[PDB]
Amino acid sequence: TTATRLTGWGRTAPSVANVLRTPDAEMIVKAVARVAESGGGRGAIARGLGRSYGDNAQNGGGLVIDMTPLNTIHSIDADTKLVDIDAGVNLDQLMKAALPFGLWVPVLPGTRQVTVGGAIACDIHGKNHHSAGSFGNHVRSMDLLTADGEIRHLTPTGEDAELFWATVGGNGLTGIIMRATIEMTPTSTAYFIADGDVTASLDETIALHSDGSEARYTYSSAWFDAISAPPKLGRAAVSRGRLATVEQLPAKLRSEPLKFDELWYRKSGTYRGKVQNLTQFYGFLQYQFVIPTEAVDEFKKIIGVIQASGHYSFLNVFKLFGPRNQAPLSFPIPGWNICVDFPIKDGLGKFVSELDRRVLEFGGRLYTAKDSRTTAETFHAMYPRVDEWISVRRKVDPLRVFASDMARRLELL
Template structure:
């Protein structure tokens, strides 16, 4: 039985299943337990056995962060209660298994939006903190944990501790990939909105230098900013790194047409047919993706301002296609994301050039600017440029090619995102995450028997 079979289950689950990350690579088998209360979560941790346990939300980590071969995995999605909302101050308290999708349904009619969202709203609050997720507004708002006021953490000794920002345990937990304990609930600040529409500006960049210049000079005008980048554009001179920039903010009420003002806070997610369960692995090759990229770039406006878009279309376009990760075929895909600091633009250019020469067929490639990083010891964002791309795993020589990119990123003082990783070499992690020794020391004191562990933790020696 696979973990997908149990994703819609109700009540307690105690079944051995095969599971993967969203990239559908590196499958392992574990005992899946679905606690319905904090007491059941504590009992599951206490009885997890010598192979330990790890919490899991909606399975959107691309790699092996929420897998635990031969041990147990706690499916936290039954703990999904919104406990309180301060509609005046914009603070919500909810269980860690609550999804951002659920919060949007509840909060948007009240005029509040989550402070940070990644490219999917189907992540849990516990996962958002454990991976310290970032979004299109990092250059303005930082990552998710910056907005957390407190969290309740079930630790290896069976205690439930209230953890506050500014403490070592908070900094180890924010971005700590679930290895300090099980997040049970959290309180965090929200962002006020007047409508559920976005006012969006779109423009083309002719090459990577044009792209970096536009982002550097004008990103401060926008709360949200992202660039789709064509990583197959090569051999066309200045076309290397050509891109489409999409930037915007929540639309004010007076920007809406009269009809839309009747229900300005209505939440209307779009849902399309699910991707087929079985597609050939070679479907998304260089020719297919190259044609898609050419079409996508050409149909984008050279410049368009103030377009009104549905909130879900702007933030989560792929959420409208259930199981979109199947389009890469049975073998799955790697999502590779790295960040290098400002001043390392030449490193970024070399990597983009290498990817283009290699012909990696990626149609989901995005470049963003990060603001200052937050204090999480294993938090991914740092001030600089981050590039994320999807690559089918069947690409010949992919492993050695990505190893080369890892080394270049580490040499430049950058890092790879652990929430998307399933293949990074352990010798590079210390260079990428300079607070890793502090993390290991605190984890050793808090959890000397490694009750909380995962395939990611074992592979990288976290």
């Protein structure tokens, strides 16, 4: 092991600890058990490609097990739609291996450079959340390495269904996911057909997302404005699409269907049925929150608060979430989700602390993947069933040999 201080993706909150990089499966197993004996000291935390901005992947003075050397793809079946992978395999890797089977990764985030281990541990969501939900909805079985040195085979139903949905979005505190089986989405091509729309106000963006035209597309998101003053505030560049069928694909592309390789602003944004690949279709404080669908006025308010703030975010992603899964600590809930990132300035930390209160007041929540600064008080209140979740954690890990900086910060230990 090499003693390395580790930060999030946004180069924040360094945590000096040991990095255990090994492809060997049983060398990992021993490290944990040989740690559990001594007792939860600093404990240990699994780490993927470190794409979450938070201190969820960092341990301070403890052990940080790197999962990336354990990246075996065991089997891909095209008939059963099943994929059996080690937790250390990434999505870019998996997406490339699945296409020759005519299979697509069920949930894709922004960057594909995320591991399966980290994908479940955050219960990550994508552009098709309104149609497919989060990543945990597609996990069929996990092989979790618990605290006592044993490995438990978990599933959505039956035994360990309680521990399963705890690991889904459990930020790696329940254990170390070693091996996962994923349900895949079948596909005829590796392309998308998209409909482009440009709104001129927040009211348009909301109406467009609520008039039921969303039921026409599987994938959808919106590049929106949070700087411009009302009524220009909230105006969005919407990108809504669907997986392309072999028939829909232009004459040249059909040959290799599964291969991988202010007026001006409005008209360029507006189009219909346009065929485009995955790449085309897809210092600073990153901030993400969701607000329940029925609380639309309160949402209109937060955007205005952001507008008047004196803080100017330009990278602004807008999304309407679909139904939630049954995971206690899953971030997504049916509502208006938006991410913003601000430039670090004076009074930012206190302003976002007011957005915490404001978001909490309307029954929404923040995403653990992007959080490094919300309090334990705010987090716990944002997540009902957090107590339920903790009572499960004490059964599986009663020594606190699984602990990250976040778990200490949010008192989830």
